[model samples]
Target chain A: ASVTQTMKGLDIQKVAGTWYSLAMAASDISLLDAQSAPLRVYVEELKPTPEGDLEILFQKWENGECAQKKIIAEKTKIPAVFKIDALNENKVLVLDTDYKKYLLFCMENQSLACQCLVRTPEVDDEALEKFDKALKALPMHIRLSFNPTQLEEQCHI
Target chain B: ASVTQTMKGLDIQKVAGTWYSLAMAASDISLLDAQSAPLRVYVEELKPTPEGDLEILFQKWENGECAQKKIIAEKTKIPAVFKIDALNENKVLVLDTDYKKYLLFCMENQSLACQCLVRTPEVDDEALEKFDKALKALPMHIRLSFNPTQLEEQCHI
Candidate 1:
């Protein structure tokens, strides 16, 4: 397989706002399904660590609280690549971005995955069409990882 | 492009743990620099929203305090897809996880971004190499978004 291609000119600062995950795909069979609900990612400001690696706050709504975990990531000359010692097996590559409102990323290693996203709860039609096109462009297996969101369901947890 | 995919069978109960944002990318040109410091993500339990969305608290260490944001995510039949109407554009997709340790997520849209992650702050040499390799695998352009962690500088803000 060819080495994955990531996005260029990705800045973590502007990306610090809350984001929504429209869909996802992974290589694992036991790990595939349509979301029963919606999911969001809140990227906040940066922090300092003992190891001197770059760190940032990645948050989500969990159990009614903002579950936080501090992570220190090594920096490279590259842009839009999400890599850290923890999930090295799943290298997150930025496939696309507009810097203000939307982004797209993927993982091509043993744990193949990809996702579609937007900045606000409501995405414009142009972005949605583009999101759909981008998903189809990925490898077949990666494309199948997302759960269809055809029905509106209530959250259980 | 094709339809974007989300994860399946992602149990939030098992996913409760400390997570780190190994790396990140965003659309804001100002955010295109490597952070001057480090940051982390913590996820706890599920909360409820008036709209019936699954709510969770996302926290980060800022200015010596844990800054948290409460968000409500919609549930899907699939698991690990953290989406909320408020932060819907920032969809947090669990690329891989053991539930207790670490997770990887991607934002798919014009905001184009990706990240590497770990479960804890403590990591080893092997893990470090894996992280670097994962990052190098990405296209060169994506390598530059990170603001260089030039110093173990104290965060004033």
Candidate 2:
């Protein structure tokens, strides 16, 4: 596979909004299994910090309770690349995003984990197409599509 | 330095209780700096899972708010060693502990980070001695002793 390119030019302000996690893929299959699936999170909001970094607020079900978590993504020289301290200072690349419909991003850690999020609970075919194309560009051994209804059932808004 | 050893015949049930963070050491000095210092957390409780794994509940200040987080440490064949999924499957070793006085543990990851905790906010000289002894057995570049009052001010009970 060719090297995955981040979005040509990402506007931090434009990407700030609520996003529903629709699909995920990882280099390790076990990361997508039931025991670790909660590691995948729903994007609640993305706000640019005063220092030009990104503040990410996300939610996931933990021990049968919905938990809200926050992580700061420090901006790099590149507009589409940032470093996340919580992930052991891993680089987070904005793989692709329409800024309105779909967002696709990948975190390069010891293993690669990519996520596809949509603006709403209902995903359109165009968004899925973009997600599929993004996955092909990365090294992913397993991919899973999440049912929006199931996600909502597990974590309420 | 020689290899650090985990506690011999660790009794998980007896290790369960509230513990205050007292000191920490890490290979990366940046991790001990003010910006990332909050990554050092106070242990609230340790409960052994039915499958022989361990559930750790800890508290830390995040963005001016104290947050409670949970991570499951999957047990290894050795009782005192466990694997933490959140830290990229890093192995956590109960390097030393006296159940009632002090606890010293290290997480083996891309970079090594160790912490010392005590049964109460006010640490005794005996606990400090045990912590120093444990530190000498491991490979650490920078070490820090945290003021119990400062930690309490940041994360309230």
Best by DockQ: 1
Q: Would you give me the overall lDDT of model 1?
A: 0.42
Runs in model 2 with CA error above 4 Å? A1-3, A154-157, B1-157
Model 1's DockQ score? 0.02
Cα lDDT tens digits for candidate 1, A53-93 = 34655454456655554455555556555455555443456
- Model 2 achieves a DockQ score of 0.01
For candidate 2, report its TM-score.
Answer: 0.46
lDDT tens per residue, model 1, B29-91:
122222221222333334444443456554544565756666666755555555544433555
Total clashing pairs for each candidate: 106, 0
DockQ of each: 0.02, 0.01
The lDDT of each candidate is: 0.42, 0.69
Leading candidate by TM-score: 2
Worst lDDT run of 10 residues, candidate 1 chain B, spans B144-153
Docking model 2 quality class: incorrect
Chain B: TM-scores of all predictions:
0.51, 0.85
For candidate 2 chain A, the 10 contiguous residues with the lowest summed lDDT are A29-38
